[PDB]
Amino acid sequence: ATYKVKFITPEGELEVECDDDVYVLDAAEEAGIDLPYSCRAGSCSSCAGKVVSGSVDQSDQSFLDDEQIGEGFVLTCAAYPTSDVTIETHKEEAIML
Ligand code: FES
Ligand SMILES: [Cl-]
């Protein structure tokens, strides 16, 4: 399966295709979109986003509190789409402060 990932970025809204076993960040980078990252391993705040519609599988992530996952935050370097999904990007600040 291949899913449509819609990114809501501070610059605007863009959609890419992302295979079901490709991390969202990597589909963005493969499309020419520069989204932030640092560890690329699921253990930092840098690539954080917020799921506003649909679902992901981000069981390879460790950094987020279940409160944080329950509120919709996702680590894009560690999240597979499981449906068409819309993600607000550049939410590092919100999962620190
Ligand atoms: S870049 Fe560190 S968790 Fe994604
Ligand atoms: Cl879907």
Author numbering: 2 to 98
Sentences from the paper on this structure:
In our current work we have identified the outer membrane receptor responsible for ferredoxin and pectocin import in Pectobacterium spp., which we designate FusA. To understand the mechanism of ferredoxin import we have solved the crystal structure of FusA and two of its plant ferredoxin substrates, and using nuclear magnetic resonance (NMR)-driven molecular docking we have modelled the FusA–ferredoxin complex.
We solved the crystal structures of Arabidopsis ferredoxin isoform 2 and potato (Solanum tuberosum) ferredoxin isoform 1 (CAC38395) (Ferpot) and performed docking with extracellular portion of the FusA structure using the programme HADDOCK22. Docking solutions formed two major clusters in which the ferredoxins docked with the extracellular pocket of FusA, with the C terminus either pointing up and away from the FusA barrel or at right angles to it. To investigate this we tested purified leaf ferredoxins from potato isoform 1, maize (Zea mays) isoform 1 (ACG46956) and Arabidopsis isoform 2, which share 70–75% sequence identity, for their ability to enhance the growth of a panel of Pectobacterium isolates. Arabidopsis ferredoxin enhanced the growth of 14/17 strains, while potato ferredoxin enhanced 9/17 strains, with a noticeably weaker overall effect.
